Every structure is written in structure tokens, then in C-alpha cells.
Write a protein that binds this DNA or RNA. Structure first.
Length: 1288
RNA sequence: CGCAUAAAGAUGAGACGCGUUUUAGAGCUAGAAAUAGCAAGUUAAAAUAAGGCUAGUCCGUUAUCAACUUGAAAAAGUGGCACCGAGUCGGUGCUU
DNA sequence: CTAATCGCCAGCGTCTCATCTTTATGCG
DNA sequence: CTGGCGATTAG
């Protein structure tokens, strides 16, 4: 009673099928449990399983980072508040209390309404003196009077709360653009004795103030004083202001690469190196400062010290001026449009721009034609083109402001009010340290131990303020654990980390693996030490023949990092010592790990007695990358040593596995769960969900067949005009004059074949006459390997093009195509795939190795995820062992590729339509199963090609002519228009076993493919995610609003809406009826939100009690997650979607003649075969065109049975009776769009030919309380039916 | 089997700029009102999943999940077979 | 005086750094 | 995209 299992794996579906040896899916009757009266269900062993897609973890990461940033911002404000705390009580005691409770309503306040001053007249006087905060900041910077302390706190708090970016390192003082651009040429003339033409008027930074990222900046540098090299024209301007890329190789006349950069960390060390091995750099830095503050600062810096506040005040004043000017102009010209612009908040006028939800762009687009209609509005259009008309202060493009501007304003504020308050003098650097502090990206979250994501190690144990940060956290250990927690361990010893790529032990290992088993006569013995000492360790790159022959004549994979450490340390003494070897092995790890140059300075100040300061700086400026693959205890931790064996001609892997001394310890050290095994796979989680469900359904199917292992498990993992322009540019002839070069409407190959082959045949130099669609057809360059590529066909006029059965091109074609067509393939008119396929007949024809390449290109799959899931299934299924300790292969895992089964669909007319029902997953699984077991029955030894002896296919060519699956066809064709018959009953190579009895197996495949009942299961889930929609709605008198905090009532403050239901519960109880408090009983379905899910799983009874229910039955609480299945009268099925909405559950089983007729009518102009076959298909579809009325009757009876959507049904029928008089090919698309009315899942809105049908949603769960609840297993074969009418 | 280049994806850390919601920015004139006419408008405070206890300048949207019987959890265990047919599975026979 | 139905609605842009895998593409 | 919600209609 052997059997086999076929599996199709997708990202939203898993299809499974169980077949016997006769390719017949069996059936069986199963017991059902519960309290109903049915006791046995007959079911077929084929089906699918559908689920929601998996989600990546990026959105949770972004929200986690947002939470951390909000907590840290609140802590910054709290730090400033407690540093102002103990002295504010002299002026105002409850000032911070009024500043805290400013959100809530006057009836809930405990102080005055006006927060900043506590009364009315001072509030109005303050807001009249200062309209914004920027007037206050400019007054506090410029004026030298003793201000109030509350104003100083307000300015500092606004400066600390928003504090710019950190993308520019180094200090930055506000210096013009062209006023310093000539000073660069002044230093260039006083430092470089040449002729630098000071083009006063070239306007480098001024034209670079526009969109001049690279191209326009380089163009402005080119349209200037010409430079002899690119390093002077573009490169020097890059190293001064723009995106820098200099080099001290052919530009700075150096003997070593001393490459500077922009404002970064390594620029100061590179400038110290360039000055200590060989002003103008200050002028370049000032030019960089001018180019950086070009676009953001739009005001002179002479009259004031704070440029940002002056820019904002200027923007405020121009907004006021243009506002009153536009008011006067619209009062003059169009007085009837006043209210639509200045009063209507719903429109996109000025009132919508200020009080509504209008942005800048919608306001500009709304006000542009009204401003164009009037007159006298020229400069307003000038401003509107420049995006400087009625501009706000807190805009969406203030993100370019660096933090040094805010730091300078804060420093001037603290300097000006210094001598009036002494605690400002005592705590200046504390406040500046509050503003500029930023946690480094390798220290991570400052935790204590209760974190899934932290790696920080502490020295002491106290709170971490920004002032004692460097005193508490160890930075070197944190920077080491930041890297070492990510790099993988080696596969041999699974607990040890991996050496760096440029380690000395790894370099010795790779040079010994190169020159231990080296033969060119095999190499010597003890002379290999002298060989690696002289030739390898002296030459920077070991030669292939030259230096080896020189070393052989003198005596009788490079170590580049050894030479770098030799010339950096300027000797060769410690580079070969004993303890200095492991010391240098620590130094190379130090150089690989960190990238901060100061913790590096500490870790090499650990080793100060090996060099002076100069060698120390020369090696400290170095860097490396890359991590290797091996270990240290693998090579020099097992004792001889592996390096001792590799030094003195066996391979390293041959020393590891083949030798019994080494392979025992690694196999012992190889000594998780399933979820941990899938968790460290590769690829998207959307595939990993399907992989886990595949393992579960395989284990369940093994369980249901009486604990017998299967035989085979088959796995399938499912998944231009510029060329014509390039051909017209390379041709030069009339490629666009008469025949237009426009591949826009051209979708078929009838135009692309003329465009690729330049309007002539690949073999004949004749007129193609492309105006005829009944013209020259297409001919494949190599027929049955199946291929339909662009470079896999040819368009000759009318011939057989040669005389052959295994070769398409002829000798005259190869003689005539050698100059023109081969140059066209060399000029990329035709691709390289067509050139080799057209010229390969001139090299002996179809050789045996080419047939091997063809069958290995048609059979072998390449993806890694399929190999890994095959490995998982083979390790979980085959587990026994013999006395020699070998794997006892009781099952065979066979992987396929979808091209084979797609060819099997399109060959024998087993057509697939995705829009009808979800049966095609199970049908693809069944077809995969039968194709796999037939192919493993026919060609036995070729199991070594895919089932996971070599048996290389060079002396096997079983297969004779072209293809692997060419034995399925009962009448094989030929190349040059011929036929070749085939026997009926196939058999194996040596064994006697009929495999492919044609009539019986095809009748069985039709009978299985037309089976009405398969098992479709939608996987029930408990919903998780956000609590509700993230928008905040204004206040209403509704009851659906959720409070944003604990004591903020939503009828006064607003809140969120539309919460997400986790699951539902069925509650039977009694509630108050009428004003007499009558206890009328009720059976109700209630929805549980996620916050309520936690609070309800803590305690159910008190939760349902306080909700409003009394005297519940505690044992009758039934949990119902999403997609719970309910069966109703007449086989109507409904899936629960929420507490108050259902979804369609049933499925439509159309007969096979209808789906074949639909596939023929849909692609009526895209047959893509032989002309006789296309003519026969056209006669087959046009010979009877009344199936579609029967299909309409089919879906009418179905929708009257289970859908109950009669209004949309009558709309569909009226649309069909309207569009009766139509062609067939335009009617197949409408009748195939029609099938989403009766589909499975959520009700969608489709579209007919002209009209559009809306969706009938199912917003009522009153019927479900008198239904049959189904509890399904993972395959749907084990059920539990519960009659809810008998419950309670 | 190993190197070089490029692209894509996954995972984690650190930072910006907006947006949204309530309050504060005394609206004026005429009528008893309904209302009308007029003037103004750019900013700030606070919250940004309710909250949790291990009280940290932590943690809270990823992954996992039919029912029943055991188990604190982890995890383990629970369902007869052939044949003729097919509108969501039905019927016949043997043995329990 | 409650239930069906219709129509609208739904947080978003950027930057810095690190480690892996996989695919294509040459070269031995 | 698919469920929630207010304004509106229908029994």
C-alpha cells in the first residue's frame, strides 16, 4: 500500500495531494466529534490551505525607534527643568505646574488659564511685543538688558526641544559665497605659481545655489577658468566646497595616497598627515561653510549674530506685506470671491491654508489661476515661481538646519545674561552638554538587563546622566560586543567566532593551502619553508611561472598585509617572532573591529613598548575590512596541528573529513527545535510561513495514512523600445523614416521581430513585407528543448531553411551571416544568445556535451530555498541507520521547476484559470506529483540529477533526440516538417514496468481534474497589531471615541476611532429589560479589542459583569477567532470576519469543458503554436458559441443558492442582455471578470464591460447564533461540529 | 573549488523635519434676536499606541496558535478497511 | 423606532553606521 | 485593501 505526496508551495497557499501507484487519489471516511448527529464523512485526499501573508519587522522597528526618541526628548526637557528648578521659586513657584497642565479644559485646571504670566494684561502685552518665538530669540541674543527668567527658560526650552541634525562634523562659525570664492583664488595665486584666471562673474557658488548636485556644478566649473586636470577644475572645487574626492597620487605629487575628504572624522587626521609629511585649507573650509549655509541662510550676517532668527523675522514680515497687498487687490478686482478665499475652510484658499488641511502645494495650485486672472500681480507670480509667497515658519524643509546654528544662538544667549544670574555662569557647559549630547550608534540602548536588544556593559552602577556618561559606560567593550553579536560562527565548531579576513594565521593558511599540494612535478618537502620565506614573503604578488622558475633555478593568494605591517613598522624583526605573532594577531583584530581612532588609540596604548610615536600614528591611521570563514582553535587549537600538517601534500578538507583523526572531534562538536531551525534560514518571512505550514501538513498526512512513511515527496516552489532606438542609432539607414521606430503599441512579436532583425530574414536577404499579418511566420532556432525567448526564434520568409531534423540553420545562412548579421550581433542589433545559437552549427552541430547542457538546463533547478526545504524534509523524514551508520533512504525528496508542469498544462489542454476558484492549487500539486513519479519511474539513474553515484550524462545519451519530457507526447513532431510515431505503453530501461498506459492514465487525470469536492481551509488567526487607526479625531458627542489618556474624557478632548477586534466570544446571559429591570435572557456575540484582550484574559467573569451582563454561564464561553467557519441551511457557508461582519464561504465547481472554453476564448489572438493548430482552435471556439449562456445560468443558480445578492445579480443580467450583440473575444474578458461575485473571501467590487457593480457586504451576525460551528484541522479532514442551537 | 565587481533583500542601532488633537493668543459695530458688515490670521505648551513592573534615559504592533484529554508551563497523546459511483461527497460489503 | 445601505476613509518624507545572504557577471 | 462609521433610507 505504497503512496506518494505532491506539494505546491506559494506565499499565500500550500497545495497538497496524495496519490497511489495508479495515479488515482484515494478516498476515505472519517469520524466527526461534537454533539451533532453526523458520524462519518467521505472525503478525498487532495486539497489546499490558504492564509494571510507574512509581514517583515521594519514597521515595528520604526515605531520602536520613535518611542525611544520621544522618551529621550522628554528626559532632556526634564533635565533643563530640574536645573532651573531650585531658583525659579523665587520668581514664580507654580510656573512649571501651569506649563504642565496647559492641555486641559478650564474646568479641570487648578490655576489660571494664561500659562506664561498668570493674568490677562501681561499675556496680551507679551504676545503683542513678540509675535513668534523668533522675535524673542533675536531680542535675547541682541539686546543687553536683564530679561525675565521665564523668557530665558522659554527660549532655551524651544532651542533644546528642536535642535537640528548632526550630519556635519567640526565647529562652524557663520561667515559671503563669492566674497570668499575669490579668496580661494587668492590663496591659489599666492601658493601655486601658475595662471589662475580670477573669473569675477563666473558665479560658481551663485549658480551652484540652484540644483547643482553634480552635473550643473561640474558644468559651472567647466564654464570657468580652464584647468589642466580634473583635480584642479572639478577636484579642487570638490575638496573645497562640493562633494569631495581628492587623491595624493597624481594630483598632490605625493609618493603615497594621502586622500582628504569632506567634513568628517578622519579629515582632521588626514590633514595632520598631509601637513606633517609635506591657510589654503582654512579658505577651503570657509568656502565649504559658505556653500553649506548658502541655501538656508538668506540674510547678511553683519548686522546681527543670530542669522536664523533674522531669516524667520524677514519671512514673517514679507508674509504680512503680501497678505495685506493681496487683500487690497482682491477687494479691488473680484469682490465676489472674497468669502471663498478668506473664509471658506473647506476650500483650498487662504483659510484652508491656515485653519484647514491644505498644504503649500494645493494652496499654490488653487491660487495660481485667480492670480493670473487679475492684473498688477507680477511680483506675486515671481514669488510664487520661487516658492516664497505666504510662507510659514515651521515648514517641511527645515530639516537642512545643522545643530551648530542652535548651539551658537544658545551660546550667545548664555553669554549675554551671564552676570545677571550666577547659576547661569556656573552651569553653562552643563546646558551646552544637554544640547549637544547624542548616544553613539554602537553603545545602543542604555539598559540594566531586561532588554531583548541591548549589549551595553557598565563599569559602575548608577544612573546615566549626560554629564557622567564617559565615566560610567565602557566604550571599548561595548564597541566590541556591537560587532561580535552579529558576525556568524563557523560551521565546523558552532560556538567559536571567526577570524578577520586579513589575519596572519589566515594568510599563512591560504598560502600553505596554495603551495602544499602544488604540482607543476610535485613540490619539495622542507624547502617549502624557504620558498614561502623568500618568494612569497618577499614579493608582493607571487607569480605563476616566472618567479617560481627563478626560485627553482636559484635554489637548484598573497601575504599583502604582512608586507603592510612590515613597511608600517619599518622592520622585519618582530614580524617573525614567537609572542609577537599572537600580539600582531591581536593588533589586526583591533584594526578590523573599531572605526573611531581613539578607542583604537587606547587599545594600542596598551602596546606602547614596540614603537615610537611616528610608527604608532602610521599604523593607527590604517584600516581593514572583511571577515573570513574559519576558526583559531580549528587551525592551532587541536594537537599534530592543522597548520603543521598543511606546512609540510594533502588538502585541508581531505585532512579534515577523510582522515579519521580530525573528523571525529568536529562530528562530536556538531552535537535545535523546528522553529529555531526555520528561524535562521534566508529569504522573506512570506516563504518561511509556507515552509512551516508545509512541514505541519506533511506530518499530518503521514499520521492520517496509518503511520506509514511515503515513497516520494515532490516539491514545487512557485514564483524594448530602447533596443530599437539603439538599433536605429547603430544602423544609420532608414530605420525610422518609412518604418516607424515606435515600439509603444507593438505588443506582439510581429513588429519586434522585424525591429530586431532590421526588417529582413536572418538567413535570406529579401523583403519581409511587414504590412501583412498573414506573412512570414516564426521558426525556432532549436525545437524539441522548449524555449520561447526573443533570441530563440527566427523569421524567414517561407522555407524549411535547411534540410535536417536536428539543425535549423544551413551552410548558406552561416556563409552569408558572417559579415553583416554577425556584425549586427556585434553592434547589439541581435543579442548574443541568437549569435551563438545561429553559429553553433558551424562547429560540428549538436554534440553530446551540448545535449548534456540542454538536459541539465531543462532539468536542474538553481534556487537555494528549495535545497534548504528539501534538506529539512529529508532530515525530518529519513532518520534510520544501518550497521555502517549510513542514511537509509526510505523516502525520496524530488524537487521540480514550474516550467515543466506549465508545459504539461499547455500541451495536453489541461488549462488553468486563476479567476474561477481556489482549486488550482490542489490541481497543481496533483500534477506535480504525477509528473515527478512518472519521471522518476522512467529514467532511474537520473535521480542523481535532482533527488536529494555521479553517473555523468556524457555516455548515457536513454534520451536520444532533444528533450526530457518528449515521451509524454503520443505523436512527436520533427524539425523540418515531418512526423515520428511513438509506442503506446511505455516501460523502464532495464526493469519490466509499464508506467504510461496512455488512455487509462489520461482518463484518470481528467477524472481527477474534474472532481467536485476538494478540501479548502482558511487558517484561523488571532489578530494582532495596532490598537486602532492612528489618526486623532476632533471632539464629538459620540460613544465610539477612545480616550487618548486615562483622565481625558473624549467628549472634551477627542481621541481615536475604529478599534481592531482580536477575537470574539459567544456569551449567553441575561441583561436588564425595560425600566423595571427585567432579566430577559439573551444570546449575544461580543467583540474583544486588544487592550480588552489583555484585560479580559486576566479575568473574564468580572469583565463581562462590568460590561453590562449578569448571571453568565462560565463554561459556555466559546472563543471565536477570525475566519471561523459556520454552516447554515442548504450548504451555505459563512466565515466570521469580525464581531459584526461575515464573509463568503462557499466555492464554485465549474465543469472542465467550460474552463477549457474560457481559456480558448480568452487568448483567441494569442494562440502561439502551429497555424493548423491555431485554425483548429479558432474553429473549435467558433463552432459553438452558446456555452456562455449555460455559464450565466450556472452562476445564476449558484448565486441564488448561496450568495443572496439579488440586486447586483439583476444588474449583471441586464448588462449581459444589453451586451449580447458583441464579439466573443471581447466577451470572454467580461465573463471572466464576472467570477468575483461568487468568489471565496471578502466581497469585492468588480467591473463589467461598461457598468460598474458595487459590493454587497454582509453586515449581520444574528443568523450565526443558530448555525453549526465547524472546527477544522490543518488539512480539513478531522472535524468537530457544534450545534449552537442546542447550546444554552 | 577560489577570487574581483555590481545590484537587491533581510536584521539591528542612532538622529532630524513635519503632521494631528485641546488650551492660550481679550475680536469690534448695529439689532431683543435671527443675523449681517468690518478687522485679524504665520506662534507656543502638552501627548504621540491605553499603559506595565523588573522602575531602566527599560518594555509595549515581528514571529507562533483548530478541538478534546493530561501537564504549572514546556510538551505528549486522541479518529477501521476494501468496492461501485459523483454537484461540495453518496451508496454497498467485512470487522468492530 | 430600530435595522439595512451608501459613501468616504485609512501617518509620512529624509540622513548616518554595521553585519549577513542571494543573484548576475567575469575570470581562473 | 477591507472593515468602521456617520448620514440616510426602509420596514
Amino acid at each position: 500500500k505504497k503512496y506518494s505526496i505532491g506539494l505546491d508551495i506559494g506565499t499565500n497557499s500550500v497545495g497538497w495531494a496524495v496519490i497511489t501507484d495508479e495515479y488515482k487519489v484515494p478516498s476515505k471516511k472519517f469520524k466527526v466529534l461534537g454533539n451533532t448527529d453526523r458520524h462519518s464523512i467521505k472525503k478525498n485526499l487532495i486539497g489546499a490551505l490558504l492564509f494571510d501573508s507574512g509581514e517583515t519587522a521594519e514597521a515595528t522597528r520604526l515605531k520602536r525607534t520613535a518611542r525611544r526618541r520621544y522618551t529621550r526628548r522628554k528626559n532632556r526637557i526634564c533635565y533643563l527643568q530640574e536645573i532651573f528648578s531650585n531658583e525659579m521659586a523665587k520668581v514664580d513657584d507654580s510656573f512649571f505646574h501651569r506649563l504642565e497642565e496647559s492641555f486641559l479644559v478650564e474646568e479641570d485646571k487648578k490655576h489660571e488659564r494664561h500659562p506664561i504670566f498668570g493674568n490677562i494684561v501681561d499675556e496680551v502685552a507679551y504676545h503683542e511685543k513678540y509675535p513668534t518665538i523668533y522675535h524673542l530669540r533675536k531680542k535675547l541674543v541682541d539686546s543687553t538688558d536683564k530679561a525675565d527668567l521665564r523668557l530665558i527658560y522659554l527660549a532655551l526650552a524651544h532651542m533644546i526641544k528642536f535642535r537640528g541634525h548632526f550630519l556635519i562634523e567640526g565647529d562652524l562659525n557663520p561667515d559671503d559665497v563669492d566674497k570668499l570664492f575669490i579668496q580661494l583664488v587668492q590663496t591659489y595665486n599666492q601658493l601655486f605659481e601658475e595662471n589662475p584666471i580670477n573669473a569675477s562673474g563666473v558665479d560658481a557658488k551663485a549658480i551652484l545655489s540652484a540644483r547643482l548636485s553634480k552635473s550643473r556644478r561640474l558644468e559651472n566649473l567647466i564654464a570657468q577658468l580652464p584647468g589642466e586636470k580634473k583635480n584642479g577644475l572639478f577636484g579642487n572645487l570638490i575638496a573645497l566646497s562640493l562633494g569631495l574626492t581628492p587623491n595624493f597620487k597624481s594630483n598632490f605629487d605625493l609618493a603615497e595616497d594621502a586622500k582628504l575628504q569632506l567634513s568628517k572624522d578622519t579629515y582632521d587626521d588626514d590633514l595632520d598627515n598631509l601637513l606633517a609629511q609635506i591657510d589654503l585649507f582654512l579658505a577651503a573650509k570657509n568656502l565649504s561653510d559658505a556653500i553649506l549655509l548658502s541655501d538656508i541662510l538668506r540674510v547678511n550676517t553683519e548686522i546681527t549674530k543670530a542669522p536664523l532668527s533674522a531669516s524667520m523675522i524677514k519671512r514673517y514680515d514679507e508674509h504680512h506685506q503680501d497678505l495685506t497687498l493681496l487683500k487690497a487687490l482682491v477687494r479691488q478686482q473680484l469682490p465676489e470671491k472674497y468669502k471663498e478665499i478668506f473664509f471658506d475652510q473647506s476650500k483650498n484658499g487662504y483659510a484652508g491654508y491656515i485653519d484647514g488641511g491644505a498644504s503649500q502645494e494645493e494652496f499654490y495650485k488653487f491660487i495660481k489661476p485667480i492670480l493670473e486672472k487679475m492684473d498688477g500681480t507680477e511680483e506675486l507670480l515671481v514669488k510664487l515661481n520661487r516658492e516664497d509667497l505666504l510662507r510659514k515658519q515651521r515648514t517641511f524643509d527645515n530639516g537642512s538646519i545643522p545643530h551648530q546654528i542652535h548651539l551658537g544662538e544658545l551660546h550667545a544667549i548664555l553669554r549675554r545674561q551671564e552676570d545677571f544670574y550666577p547659576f547661569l555662569k556656573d552651569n553653562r557647559e552643563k546646558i551646552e552638554k544637554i544640547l549637544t549630547f547624542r548616544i553613539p550608534y554602537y553603545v545602543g540602548p542604555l539598559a540594566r538587563g531586561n532588554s531583548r536588544f541591548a549589549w551595553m556593559t557598565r563599569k559602575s552602577e548608577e544612573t546615566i546622566t549626560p554629564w557622567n556618561f564617559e565615566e560610567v559606560v565602557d566604550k571599548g567593550a561595548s564597541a566590541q560586543s556591537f560587532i561580535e553579536r552579529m558576525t556568524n560562527f563557523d560551521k565546523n565548531l558552532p560556538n567559536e567566532k571567526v577570524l578577520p579576513k586579513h589575519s596572519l594565521l589566515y594568510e599563512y593558511f591560504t598560502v600553505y593551502n596554495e603551495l602544499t599540494k602544488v604540482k607543476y612535478a610535485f613540490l619539495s618537502g622542507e624547502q617549502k619553508k624557504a620558498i614561502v620565506d623568500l618568494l612569497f614573503k618577499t614579493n608582493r604578488k607571487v607569480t605563476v611561472k616566472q618567479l617560481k622558475e627563478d626560485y627553482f633555478k636559484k635554489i637548484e593568494a598573497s601575504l599583502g598585509t604582512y608586507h603592510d605591517l612590515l613597511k608600517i613598522i619599518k622592520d622585519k624583526d618582530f614580524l617573525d617572532n614567537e609572542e609577537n605573532e599572537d600580539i600582531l594577531e591581536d593588533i589586526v583584530l583591533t584594526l578590523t573591529l573599531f572605526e573611531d581612532r581613539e578607542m583604537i588609540e587606547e587599545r594600542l596604548k596598551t602596546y606602547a613598548h614596540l614603537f615610537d610615536d611616528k610608527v604608532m600614528k602610521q599604523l593607527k591611521r590604517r584600516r581593514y575590512t572583511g571577515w573570513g570563514r574559519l576558526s583559531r582553535k580549528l587551525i592551532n587549537g587541536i594537537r599534530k596541528t592543522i597548520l603543521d600538517f598543511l606546512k609540510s601534500n594533502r588538502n585541508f578538507m581531505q585532512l579534515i573529513h577523510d582522515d579519521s583523526l580530525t573528523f571525529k572531534e568536529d562530528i562530536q562538536k556538531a552535537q535545535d527545535s523546528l522553529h529555531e531551525h526555520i528561524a535562521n534560514l534566508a529569504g522573506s518571512p512570506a516563504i518561511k510561513k509556507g515552509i512551516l505550514q508545509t512541514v505541519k501538513v506533511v506530518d499530518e498526512l503521514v499520521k492520517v495514512m496509518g503511520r506509514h512513511k511515503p515513497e516520494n515527496i515532490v516539491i514545487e516552489m512557485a514564483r524594448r523600445m530602447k533596443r530599437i532606438e539603439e538599433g536605429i542609432k547603430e544602423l544609420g539607414s532608414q530605420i525610422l523614416k518609412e518604418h516607424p521606430v515606435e515600439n509603444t503599441q507593438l505588443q506582439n512579436e510581429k513588429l519586434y521581430l522585424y525591429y530586431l532583425q532590421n526588417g529582413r530574414d536572418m538567413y535570406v536577404d529579401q523583403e519581409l513585407d511587414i504590412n501583412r499579418l498573414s506573412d512570414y511566420d516564426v521558426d525556432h532556432i532549436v525545437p524539441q528543448l522548449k524555449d520561447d525567448s526573443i533570441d530563440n526564434k527566427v523569421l524567414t520568409r517561407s522555407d524549411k531553411n535547411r534540410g535536417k531534423s536536428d539543425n535549423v540553420p544551413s551552410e548558406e545562412v552561416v556563409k552569408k551571416m558572417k559579415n553583416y548579421w554577425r556584425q549586427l550581433l556585434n553592434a547589439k542589433l541581435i543579442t548574443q544568445r541568437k549569435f551563438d545559437n545561429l553559429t553553433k552549427a558551424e562547429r560540428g552541430g549538436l554534440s553530446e556535451l551540448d545535449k548534456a547542457g540542454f538536459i541539465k538546463r531543462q532539468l536542474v533547478e538553481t534556487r537555494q530555498i528549495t535545497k534548504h526545504v528539501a534538506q529539512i524534509l529529508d532530515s525530518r523524514m529519513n532518520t534510520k541507520y544501518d550497521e555502517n551508520d549510513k542514511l537509509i533512504r526510505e523516502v525520496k525528496v524530488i524537487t521540480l521547476k514550474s516550467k515543466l508542469v506549465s508545459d504539461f498544462r499547455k500541451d495536453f489542454q489541461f488549462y488553468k484559470v486563476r479567476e474561477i476558484n481556489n482549486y488550482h492549487h490542489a490541481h497543481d500539486a496533483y500534477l506535480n506529483a504525477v509528473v515527478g513519479t512518472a519521471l522518476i519511474k522512467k529514467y532511474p539513474k537520473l535521480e542523481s540529477e535532482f533527488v536529494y553515484k555521479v553517473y555523468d550524462v556524457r555516455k548515457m545519451i536513454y534520451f536520444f533526440y532533444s528533450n526530457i519530457m518528449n515521451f509524454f507526447k503520443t505523436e512527436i513532431t520533427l524539425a523540418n516538417g515531418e512526423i515520428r510515431k511513438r509506442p503506446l505503453i511505455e516501460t523502464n530501461g532495464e526493469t519490466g514496468e509499464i508506467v504510461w498506459d496512455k488512455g487509462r492514465d489520461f482518463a484518470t487525470v481528467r477524472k481527477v481534474l474534474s472532481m467536485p469536492q476538494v478540501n479548502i481551509v482558511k487558517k484561523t488567526e488571532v489578530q494582532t497589531g495596532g490598537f486602532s487607526k492612528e489618526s486623532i479625531l476632533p471632539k464629538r458627542n459620540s460613544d465610539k471615541l477612545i480616550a487618548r489618556k486615562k483622565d481625558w474624557d473624549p467628549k472634551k478632548y477627542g481621541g481615536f476611532d475604529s478599534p481592531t477586534v482580536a477575537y470574539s466570544v459567544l456569551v449567553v446571559a441575561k441583561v436588564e429589560k425595560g425600566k423595571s429591570k427585567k432579566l430577559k435572557s439573551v444570546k449575544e456575540l461580543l467583540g474583544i479589542t486588544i487592550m480588552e484582550r489583555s484585560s479580559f484574559e486576566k479575568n473574564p467573569i468580572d469583565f463581562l459583569e462590568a460590561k453590562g451582563y449578569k448571571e453568565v454561564k462560565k463554561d459556555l464561553i466559546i472563543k471565536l477567532p477570525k475566519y471561523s467557519l459556520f454552516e447554515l441551511e442548504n450548504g451555505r457557508k459563512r466565515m466570521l470576519a469580525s464581531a459584526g461582519e461575515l464573509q463568503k464561504g462557499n466555492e464554485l465547481a465549474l465543469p472542465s469543458k467550460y474552463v477549457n472554453f474560457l481559456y480558448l476564448a480568452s487568448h483567441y489572438e494569442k494562440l502561439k503554436g502551429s497555424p493548423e493548430d491555431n485554425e483548429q482552435k479558432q474553429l473549435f471556439v467558433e463552432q459553438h458559441k452558446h456555452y456562455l449562456d449555460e455559464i450565466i445560468e450556472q452562476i445564476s443558480e449558484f448565486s441564488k443558492r448561496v450568495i443572496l445578492a439579488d440586486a447586483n445579480l439583476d444588474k449583471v443580467l441586464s448588462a449581459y442582455n444589453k451586451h449580447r450583440d458583441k464579439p466573443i473575444r471581447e466577451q470572454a474578458e467580461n465573463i471572466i471578470h464576472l467570477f468575483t461575485l461568487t468568489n471565496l473571501g471578502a466581497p469585492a467590487a468588480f467591473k463589467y464591460f461598461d457598468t460598474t457593480i458595487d459590493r454587497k457586504r454582509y453586515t449581520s451576525t444574528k443568523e450565526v447564533l443558530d448555525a453549526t460551528l465547524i472546527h477544522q484541522s490543518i488539512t480539513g479532514l478531522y472535524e468537530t461540529r457544534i450545534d449552537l442551537s442546542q447550546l444554552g
